[PDB]
Design a protein around this motif. Sequence first.
Motif, mmCIF file in Angstrom:
data_model
loop_
_atom_site.group_PDB
_atom_site.id
_atom_site.type_symbol
_atom_site.label_atom_id
_atom_site.label_comp_id
_atom_site.label_asym_id
_atom_site.label_seq_id
_atom_site.Cartn_x
_atom_site.Cartn_y
_atom_site.Cartn_z
ATOM 1 N N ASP A 64 0.861 -1.119 0.023
ATOM 2 C CA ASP A 64 -0.029 0.055 0.266
ATOM 3 C C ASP A 64 0.685 1.063 -0.360
ATOM 4 O O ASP A 64 2.082 1.529 -0.444
ATOM 5 N N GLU A 65 -0.137 2.321 0.836
ATOM 6 C CA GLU A 65 0.732 3.172 0.119
ATOM 7 C C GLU A 65 1.815 3.826 0.815
ATOM 8 O O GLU A 65 2.655 3.459 1.996
ATOM 9 N N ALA A 120 9.410 5.935 -0.633
ATOM 10 C CA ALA A 120 8.561 5.529 -1.572
ATOM 11 C C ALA A 120 8.122 6.193 -3.189
ATOM 12 O O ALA A 120 7.791 5.957 -4.012
ATOM 13 N N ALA A 121 9.226 7.705 -2.969
ATOM 14 C CA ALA A 121 8.785 7.681 -4.388
ATOM 15 C C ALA A 121 9.642 7.217 -5.461
ATOM 16 O O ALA A 121 9.447 6.993 -6.140
ATOM 17 N N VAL A 122 10.883 7.377 -4.889
ATOM 18 C CA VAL A 122 12.269 6.385 -5.306
ATOM 19 C C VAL A 122 11.549 5.728 -5.195
ATOM 20 O O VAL A 122 11.805 4.170 -6.570
ATOM 21 N N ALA A 127 -1.687 8.534 -5.045
ATOM 22 C CA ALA A 127 -1.625 9.248 -4.338
ATOM 23 C C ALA A 127 -0.087 9.466 -5.088
ATOM 24 O O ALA A 127 1.142 11.169 -4.309
ATOM 25 N N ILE A 128 0.362 8.925 -5.976
ATOM 26 C CA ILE A 128 1.622 9.578 -7.112
ATOM 27 C C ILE A 128 0.972 11.706 -7.056
ATOM 28 O O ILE A 128 1.856 12.673 -7.228
ATOM 29 N N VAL A 129 -0.338 11.500 -7.532
ATOM 30 C CA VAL A 129 -0.193 13.077 -8.224
ATOM 31 C C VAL A 129 0.035 13.872 -6.686
ATOM 32 O O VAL A 129 0.202 14.755 -7.094
ATOM 33 N N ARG A 130 -1.404 13.930 -5.790
ATOM 34 C CA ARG A 130 -0.676 14.326 -4.885
ATOM 35 C C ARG A 130 0.460 14.345 -4.386
ATOM 36 O O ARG A 130 0.959 16.319 -3.890
ATOM 37 N N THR A 157 7.141 9.301 -13.015
ATOM 38 C CA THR A 157 5.871 7.573 -13.048
ATOM 39 C C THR A 157 5.611 7.783 -13.612
ATOM 40 O O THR A 157 5.107 7.485 -14.551
ATOM 41 N N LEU A 158 4.197 8.592 -13.891
ATOM 42 C CA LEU A 158 3.310 8.941 -14.078
ATOM 43 C C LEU A 158 3.221 9.021 -15.769
ATOM 44 O O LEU A 158 2.475 8.144 -16.395
#
Length: 490
Positions: A2-3, A11-13, A37-40, A57-58
């Motif tokens: 999960d998040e 977690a972004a890396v 949550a990636i966006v946020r 990522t996106l």
Amino acid sequence: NDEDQVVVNKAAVMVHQLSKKEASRHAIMRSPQMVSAIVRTMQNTNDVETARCTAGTLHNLSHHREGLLAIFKSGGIPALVKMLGSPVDSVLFYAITTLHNLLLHQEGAKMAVRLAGGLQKMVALLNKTNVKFLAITTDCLQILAYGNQESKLIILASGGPQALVNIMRTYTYEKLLWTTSRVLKVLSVCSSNKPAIVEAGGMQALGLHLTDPSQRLVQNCLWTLRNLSDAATKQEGMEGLLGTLVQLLGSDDINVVTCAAGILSNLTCNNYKNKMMVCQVGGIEALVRTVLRAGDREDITEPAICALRHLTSRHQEAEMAQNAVRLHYGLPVVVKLLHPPSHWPLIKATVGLIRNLALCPANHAPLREQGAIPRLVQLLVRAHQDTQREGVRMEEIVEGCTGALHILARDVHNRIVIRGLNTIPLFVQLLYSPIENIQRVAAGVLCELAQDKEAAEAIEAEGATAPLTELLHSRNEGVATYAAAVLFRM
């Protein structure tokens, strides 16, 4: 798993490395939860390596059809647009690329980007200096503006025209020049953008690339130039452009020839400076050859004749251009274009050219020998009858033919031919025309004919005294002068 939570970026890396490997990347866009949550994280974080990692990522997700939708419904579009305000430098890249993919394939993205204020953001980025970034940015603007007058006016307000022209003046990167030219082409058909492009020096800028090896770039610049020249203003520094256009008339590509003729036609109209230069670089010879080579292709002959009409009047080398048409074997084909299968626009343009060519005394005999006069008479007779019974109005054919005959009637042998076709009753009838310009050339041709006593009597016998007397009080001073001139010789 999960998040992420709060105060942790690792977690972004995280999400990154997986977006690379297809296996996890499917899982990640299959998850309408954390993609948000990636966006946020992206929009909100003030960390650099985290922001760039998040945008990247996106991007990786935007390659897949569901990855688009994942970003789409997650409200990623307004976020990515906000990331177009991001500072240096790689975040701008992932953002503009993702939007690009969305704009290309994802449906609903267009309007979504427009609503997010994407157009304003993208136009602002046109002052950047990375050609690949500029190529992507300009393509987005093209996708957004095409068939959408709303976007075109926004781009205009944001200063699109000037930024796009500057790009054309600065860079040599073909893909960028091409992409930028496609945006300018889309804007060129807009009545509001067109003058702005022209004012930005768009025509000179586009003229720079007319000799580029890339045909798609050349053609785009030509297409745009034709739309822009379509009633443009008095520009300076057009010397090079005009020279290249004349040069392009000899091209083996018909579409290059068609555009070059059209642009030259537009740029010479009521612009003696442009008339001079075109003549001085061999415009007449080139335009004559073009007409001869074009055959019955009226896509070519019509703007070519129109251009020739402009060049053969009202400038310092007008007389020279009038001779040049003859000297370059032009008179026979010009007269030929008065006949079928020529359509009205070409016929009207041709008549107007004959009118200018007839101003040159040395053209009187050859025009007569080619059979211009009877054909001009047949056109006038039939055009007049049709006015008595939108496109081209016959009132213009009537005025044009009468005008050409007016000039040709300066020659003695022509007056005998004209008179011998029983034209005097028609000319006198034209004195009753509601249109002043028709009255003027009708009275003018009679004035020329009435210099011969035998004709002056036939004119009087035709009952021309009464109409001419009424035209003495015409508010059109020119009409009155001719009317009095005929009356006198009677």
